Amino acid sequence: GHHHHHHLEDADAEFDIVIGNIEDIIMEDEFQHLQQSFMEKYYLEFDDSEENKLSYTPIFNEYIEILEKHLEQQLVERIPGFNMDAFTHSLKQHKDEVSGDILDMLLTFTDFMAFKEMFTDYRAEKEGRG
């Protein structure tokens, strides 16, 4: 890992979809549950990854795998509580069953206040917070 930039679209529509909604859901997890669920059903009911040209196939898989991997371990060990990041939902399967609602309820001991503080600051500012 040693790059940073945005591009592609027509090749991987689903990617751009989750990407945009991801930066937005950063404030609300539920939002992702709905959006993601939509793209998931549509995608699964259409095609899968490993698409695009012969160069995009690997470049895409690697890239996504890199971020997904890092964010995966982070989100997994995150368990902040309050609607910190929906990345978890689209990360594994669906955190809708238990989001900031119940999570923050008990995990209130340390809501996303702190977690999101640094996490969001980087994640958001990274996706293009503004």
Curated annotation (Swiss-Prot):
Subcellular location per the Swiss-Prot or TrEMBL entry: Cytoplasm; Mitochondrion intermembrane space; Cytoplasm, Cytoskeleton, Microtubule organizing center, Centrosome; Nucleus
Principal location class: cytoplasm
Keywords: Cell projection, Cilium, Cytoplasm, Cytoskeleton, Mitochondrion, Nucleus
Keyword Mitochondrion applies: yes
GO CC annotations, alphabetized: centrosome; cilium; mitochondrial intermembrane space; nucleus; spindle
Domain of life: Eukaryota
Function as written in the Swiss-Prot or TrEMBL entry: Plays a role as an effector of the ADP-ribosylation factor-like protein 2, ARL2.
Family: Belongs to the ARL2BP family.
Protein's name in the database: ADP-ribosylation factor-like protein 2-binding protein
Organism name: Danio rerio
Gene name of the encoded protein: arl2bp
Residues of the full protein shown: 19 to 139 of 168
